[PDB]
Amino acid sequence: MSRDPLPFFPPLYLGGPEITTENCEREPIHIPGSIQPHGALLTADGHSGEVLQMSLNAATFLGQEPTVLRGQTLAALLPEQWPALQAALPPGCPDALQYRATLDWPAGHLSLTVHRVGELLILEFEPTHALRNAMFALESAPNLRALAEVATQTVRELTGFDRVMLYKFAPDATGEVIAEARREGLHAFLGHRFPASDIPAQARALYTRHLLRLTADTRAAAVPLDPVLNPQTNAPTPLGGAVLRATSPMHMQYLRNMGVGSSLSVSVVVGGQLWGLIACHHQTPYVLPPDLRTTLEYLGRLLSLQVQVKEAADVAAFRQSLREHHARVALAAAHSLSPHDTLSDPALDLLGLMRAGGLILRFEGRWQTLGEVPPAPAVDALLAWLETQPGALVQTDALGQLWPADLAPSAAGLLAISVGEGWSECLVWLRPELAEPWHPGEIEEAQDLRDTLTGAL
Amino acid sequence: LPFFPPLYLGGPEITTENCEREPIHIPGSIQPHGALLTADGHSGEVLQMSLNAATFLGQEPTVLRGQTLAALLPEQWPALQAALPPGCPDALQYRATLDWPAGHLSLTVHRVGELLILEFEPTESTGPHALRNAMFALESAPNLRALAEVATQTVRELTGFDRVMLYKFAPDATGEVIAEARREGLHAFLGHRFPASDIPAQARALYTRHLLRLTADTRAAAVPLDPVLNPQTNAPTPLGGAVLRATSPMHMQYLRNMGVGSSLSVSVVVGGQLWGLIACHHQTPYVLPPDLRTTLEYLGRLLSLQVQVKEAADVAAFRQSLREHHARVALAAAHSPHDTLSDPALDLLGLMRAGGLILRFEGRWQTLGEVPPAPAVDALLAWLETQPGALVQTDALGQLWPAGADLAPSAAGLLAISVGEGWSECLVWLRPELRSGYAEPWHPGEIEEAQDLRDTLTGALE
Ligand SMILES: *C/C=C1/C(=C/c2[nH]c(/C=C3[NH+]=C(/C=C4\NC(=O)C(C=C)=C4C)C(C)=C\3CCC(=O)O)c(CCC(=O)O)c2C)NC(=O)[C@H]1C
Ligand SMILES: *C/C=C1/C(=C/c2[nH]c(/C=C3[NH+]=C(/C=C4\NC(=O)C(C=C)=C4C)C(C)=C\3CCC(=O)O)c(CCC(=O)O)c2C)NC(=O)[C@H]1C
């Protein structure tokens, strides 16, 4: 889930491998060299504004002759916008930043979206309060599930989409539909789980930076960029920040198998990490208007923050229940005439403090244990390994990977603190293999215990 | 003690002595840049109208009253009932655009009790999308101060307002301008502190529920509702959820003293509590368009969450630098509280950057540092006993506790925690007045540190 994606294969127009379920992660979805036909795309030099590339539908769509359009400057094409465009998108700005305008064209009202990648401007053209009311229901939501339900119902009312889901990522990057608003007659996805590869790592990475993407018509063929390569670089044009970017054929096929005619998702990003997706399906082709997409992008940002805040409160609520327990222990440690007698007291329940299966206590050149632990030789080896570790805290949810593993029945997870320096005196909490991850609160609680014990002893 | 009656019910004239009792939610009047109707929730019979309704709606108030929303708004009336069902929150709004002989007309409707309130104002996505672009700068902001600066700069670019401030409330409801974006030439309010009464309790309460309010023209007279009382109840019409609500005259005077021609603020609400305000000033009258107001309401919601997150990070960063000291204190508390907590080695004074400290335990008290004399301490402790909860904190003890204003040399700022219930045992950190009546504000990290101390001591002593 946090892993960097494997490096991309070349695209099909550069003779790249055919994409299968075995090589999902390596499809270069960001450089399809093509767009969706409900809009037109130009690329232009960031300095001169010379038009370098155009989609093959762009001449017809803008009503200019191909030869005339290619080579023209944005000064000539977009005299009113060109000045504002340069100011809004200065060199080195993020590629997610966008200049947007509304044009009159000989095709009525036309939406223009511009963004910058490297030395290249990418211009996308396409034809062109209920949220405010849902904000109360969003704020009121007493938990993540309730919030998910409100979000999906809200988005469905906004868009008219036949299905709207909140898809939540597990730490292994598998997903679960935790909420769903759907048209009567459709079978429910609610509660269904899906493998990591249904949204592969390069997609999840892309979706952490570019927060909305869509397929307007799942039966429509992509329109190529001409030339397909960027003349500046003689390399593929990055289209990750372009909403008109052509969708992965693999995914479009998957959509068609689901009888989905149109699709849209918005990223839910929490702590720089992709938490989930607002996933929308329509049975029929549907170009969602640009202004409504803006609304969904806003909803995504709001929901992201609501999750971050709610999760922070769960953490704080959990850590509060470790202070009461910690106080009991600090009290005992203050009076202690021997850490062995005090800390091994079942009444103190140092096991339960960390939701551990086992605990090793070493003090005064001897150790003892509570709960399920490895046998004495394994404990001795564990302690000998610990001595080699720098710092005063070691924590792992898979001891095997860090310390190559046979202790996994009782000691798959490990959390150890030095009570002083050198690990001559220490506590080691152990957890069995499924280990259940140490909560960040349990880690800080261990740090607090280190201080307390270091002082008291 | 209750709100005073409004002026049209012969209520007291509002002064600096009786601020908190002005019923700002029932002024029985609106701002003249729009029109307001009220109507029965069931029948849609028009019950009240602003005396200017005629300019906006084309018809005379007397003529319009008695007609139904079915007759007046045939297209919207069906949708209006569905959007605002009985018992819905009063913050919920139906909105529409109407065609009128003169561009268009913006209609905003909301429901209070058995009453629908309809607001009409003239109207004509640059703003919504300009917000989208600012979201990156908001997310990027590395701390609360930087976030505050981005927020104010963003709002100023959206609106064109001459000044945009982020006003943060202390827990005693005193405030500080923690960020400011202003036109060239204006003197800065940044860092200035203001007493609780500049935004009084009933205003702050209203602002926790209704998140945007404005004064379009600070020299323009409010337009009365006719009749002023609600025929349903023979009582004042709640206008708290109406953006056209007339502004408190006291506040409008304050705005004029500041050379403010137009004012708008958005509530920053964090944990159901008013955290602060995005406060906007224009030197000249300015009706912000309805669509831009919608944008600001959205920004306020977003910023509320961004503030909570960014502020939590500042607190954690601050408390990390106090961990060694905190541990020392927790260790000592785990072991007579008088002997332990008075120990200079613990330095409970320095923990909170305090000048003084009162320790009450076992029916006696003692002090460290600069403190008031015994009778003042006894009075302070007696006042504390009357306070609800287990934490009292103030950066200006005088404003909250007027009899304690004379303690300002040693006790301008106060932070007190109960170690039992009822304040029989407590700690009181004191700070001197700044070299008026304000002490250096308590950092939110020092507050949570105090809460942690409370828990530890409460547990250890029981
Ligand atoms: C070889 C890899 C495969 C693959 C590729 C793939 N998938 C996406 C994007 C999406 N896949 C989604 C999956 C689901 N949609 C649903 O409705 C459900 C279940 C109810 C699932 C699991 C979703 C939501 C997306 C996001 C895009 C969207 O909103 O429509 C991509 C990237 C698409 C692009 O941006 O170009 C790729 C390459 N899909 C597979 O199933 C595996 C075999
Ligand atoms: C004795 C009465 C007083 C009084 C009452 C009062 N104040 C408000 C509302 C506001 N006061 C604000 C204060 C400030 N604006 C600034 O620019 C600064 C500092 C530079 C401060 C301290 C603000 C921002 C508001 C909100 C309204 C707005 O956004 O303009 C009310 C309620 C107004 C209403 O909603 O009807 C009342 C009754 N304020 C005083 O200062 C004293 C004179």
Taking the CA of residue B207 as reference, the ligand 2 atom at the shortest distance is 35
How far off is chain B from A330, nearest CA to CA, in Å? Answer: 6
Would you say B415 and B446 are in contact if contact means Cβ atoms under 8 Å apart?
yes
First CA to last CA distance, chain B: 37
* Secondary structure (DSSP) of A273-324: EEEEEEEEEESS-----HHHHHHHHHHHHHHHHHHHHHHHHHHHHHHHHHHH
Would you say A249 and A18 are in contact if contact means Cβ atoms under 8 Å apart?
no
Beta strands in B10-50 (DSSP E): 29-30, 35-40, 46-50
Assess whether the C-beta atom of B304 lies below 6 angstroms from ligand 2. Answer: no
A317 interfaces chain B, CB cutoff of 8 Å? no
Assess whether the C-beta atom of B213 lies below 6 angstroms from ligand 2. Answer: yes
Residue in the structure block whose two tokens are 């009888």: A259
- What is the architecture, at CATH level 2, of domain B7-11+18-122? 2-Layer Sandwich (3.30)
Quote the tokens at residue B419: 């170690």
Taking the CA of residue A248 as reference, the ligand 1 atom at the shortest distance is 36
- What is the architecture, at CATH level 2, of domain A12-16+23-127? 2-Layer Sandwich (3.30)
* Cβ–Cβ gap B129/A294 under 8 Å: yes
Residue in the structure block whose two tokens are 């493998």: A195
Assess whether the C-beta atom of B277 lies below 6 angstroms from ligand 2. Answer: yes
| CA A247 to ligand 1 center in whole angstroms | 10
Cα A204 to Cα A434: distance, rounded to the nearest angstrom: 27
Beta bridge partners of A428: A360, A416
Residue of A332, A326, A334, A335 lying closest to A344 (CA atoms): A332
Q: Which letter does DSSP use for residue A23 in this model?
A: S
Cβ-proximal residues to B385 (8 Å cutoff; 6+ apart), any chain: B422, B423
Cα B40 to Cα B114: distance, rounded to the nearest angstrom: 6
Cα B181 to Cα B150: distance, rounded to the nearest angstrom: 9
Quote the tokens at residue A167: 């898809």
Cα A376 to Cα A368: distance, rounded to the nearest angstrom: 9
Cα B86 to Cα B119: distance, rounded to the nearest angstrom: 19
Assess whether the C-beta atom of A247 lies below 6 angstroms from ligand 1. Answer: yes
Cα B432 to Cα A265: distance, rounded to the nearest angstrom: 56
For A309, the closest of B93, B298, B308 (CB atoms) is B308
Which value, in Å, is the radius of gyration of the alpha carbons in chain B?
Answer: 26
Beta bridge partners of A115: A122
Residue B130's CB: how many other CB atoms inside 10 A? 16
A316 interfaces chain B, CB cutoff of 8 Å? no
Residue A119's CB: how many other CB atoms inside 10 A? 12
Quote the tokens at residue A279: 């996933």
Specify the experimental method.
X-ray
Q: Record the resolution, in angstroms.
A: 2.3
* Cβ–Cβ gap B132/A297 under 8 Å: yes
Cα B86 to Cα B109: distance, rounded to the nearest angstrom: 13
Taking the CA of residue B263 as reference, the ligand 2 atom at the shortest distance is 30
